[PDB]
Amino acid sequence: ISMKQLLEAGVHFGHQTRRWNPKMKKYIFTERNGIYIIDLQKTVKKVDEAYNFLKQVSEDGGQVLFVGTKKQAQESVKSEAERAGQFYINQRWLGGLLTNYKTISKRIKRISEIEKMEEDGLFEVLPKKEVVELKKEYDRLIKFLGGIRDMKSMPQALFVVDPRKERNAIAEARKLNIPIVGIVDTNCDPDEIDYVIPANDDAIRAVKLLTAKMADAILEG
RNA sequence: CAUGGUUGUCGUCAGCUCGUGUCGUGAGAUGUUGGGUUAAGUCCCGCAACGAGCGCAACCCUUAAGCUUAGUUGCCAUCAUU
Ligand SMILES: [Mg+2]
Ligand SMILES: [Mg+2]
Ligand SMILES: [Mg+2]
């Protein structure tokens, strides 16, 4: 990426000074209109490191999980993950998604079973009330577990659009020692994330640019 | 007041719990709370919970309406008769 591209994206924009995290001071360049401005020069170097890492994991064939429950990133996470053929979560992070994957795995299997029953044509045989509730279960499973249906093993890396929003995802990854690549805004804390990209996560344009670049690395691998 | 079996009672009240995960030094907690909703821990939505079980409900019996099958010991409209 280039600084001009980043400036157009709105990556430089940051949260209000009051809501900042002091640990991210290095990344901050200046304060304008009561908003800290991310240093793009640091961002470009950071983007490169994460891009290299994601290409490396993709070269190894390691799976990557994209998390963007934030409204801005929901659409971007879905599209880029599909492009790169990687797992995504854009609705809600179920507690114990990775730590309790033994239970979660069964829920993934359930989605296939519900489809199988429809394919079998048991659905017509089943009582209407039972078929309605079965459909409702399936839709709920698709809503939350749709992105990771294909996943059968722990993702080699996680991509998080907003670490502060996705606290549970960060915690589970750190417990399981999974490397984290994240878009960290001024408010967020960078210590937890292994690969930190300092950027605005409140802009659809900004998130899309960064997630696309990461997807490209996965595509390259 | 050594017991099995059987029973009353709170109360047919909507509870009571567990596995895995997570949190807590720990006893614990979460789930099971919250916003609505229901007869209902009923259901929905949200939510470090994700699920599951015993309860709830439903399946059963009886009662309130038809159809088809059958018609004696039941019934008698169509007629004779008593
Ligand atoms: Mg209780
Ligand atoms: Mg229940
Ligand atoms: Mg009952």
Curated annotation (Swiss-Prot):
Gene3D superfamilies assigned to the protein according to its UniProt record, in alphabetical order: Glucose-6-phosphate isomerase like protein, domain 1, Helix hairpin bin
Origin: domain of life: Bacteria
GO biological process: translation
UniProt cross-references to InterPro entries, sorted A to Z: Ribosomal_uS2, Ribosomal_uS2_bac/mit/plastid, Ribosomal_uS2_CS, Ribosomal_uS2_flav_dom_sf
KW tRNA processing (keyword) present: no
Record-level GO cellular component terms: cytosolic small ribosomal subunit
Gene Ontology molecular function, alphabetical: structural constituent of ribosome
Alphabetical UniProt keywords: Ribonucleoprotein, Ribosomal protein
Entry similarity comment: Belongs to the universal ribosomal protein uS2 family.
Protein name per its UniProtKB record: Small ribosomal subunit protein uS2
Species for this entry: Staphylococcus aureus (strain NCTC 8325 / PS 47)
